[PDB]
Design a protein around this ligand. Structure first.
Ligand SMILES: [Cu+]
Length: 99
């Protein structure tokens, strides 16, 4: 599943921001507009026992250039909330459900 980092109109959003997937399916987060961006899973809002570091950028890490990507596949079922660190308050957040 491809997820744009920044919408095509410049909005500071993941597109899509809420979506499902099945275990092992690639998520490719791609810098689109308004970069730098990053993808951080919220360590308090992911499934029991999941290591957020295995699936996240750190908050200090950035994707700098247009078209740069961060790929992650999730395994464990349940809800995972994530955000872009520098743009979280602007509303650049999302939630993926592994089902
Ligand atoms: Cu961002």
């Amino acid at each position: 599943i491809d997820v744009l980092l920044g919408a095509d109109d410049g909005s500071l959003a993941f597109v899509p921001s809420e979506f499902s997937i099945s275990p092992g399916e690639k998520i490719v987060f791609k810098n689109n507009a308004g970069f730098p961006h990053n993808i951080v899973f919220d360590e308090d809002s992911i499934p029991s026992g999941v290591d957020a570091s295995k699936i996240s950028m750190s908050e200090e890490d950035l994707l700098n250039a247009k078209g740069e990507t961060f790929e992650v596949a999730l395994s464990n079922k349940g809800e995972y909330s994530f955000y872009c660190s520098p743009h979280q308050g602007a509303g650049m957040v999302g939630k993926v459900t592994v089902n």
